[PDB]
Copies of this chain bind each other. A is one copy, B any other.
């Protein structure tokens, strides 16, 4: 598996605008929300769950990087894999997207797979 696989999805020129942390089924987790820097479109919601999904190993790295980008407000590309989380109240609160990568963007390009 790889962040860059074309079976994942991504959204460029987004800014992390909200951040949540909690626990589910003994697993710490966090979710983020991103919105287009230019105000268009609809928000992206993704979560990482510390001991769930193939993406479990990068939980801490993605949490630290999400916090960094959240506090700077900079434009990023968010990479997710859709339809991973299944608990209905959780999905309805947040989404089913697993968070699989974050890429800083310049005004012209984003530094990550495309």
Could you tell me which A residues sit within 8 Å of B by CB distance? Answer: 1-4, 17-28, 30-31, 33, 50, 54-55, 57-58, 60-65, 67-68, 71-72, 79, 87, 89-90, 93, 100-107, 111-114
With A71-B68, A111-B31, A111-B33 in contact, is A21–B58 under 8 Å at CB? yes
How many copies of this chain does one complex carry?
A: 5
Rounded to whole Å, the gap between the CB of A92 and the closest CB of chain B is 9
With A67-B68, A87-B2, A90-B4 in contact, is A112–B28 under 8 Å at CB? no
Contact B24 A1 (CB under 8 A): yes
Q: Which residues of the partner chain B approach A57 to less than 8 Å between Cβ atoms? A: 23, 26-28, 50
Contact B20 A103 (CB under 8 A): yes
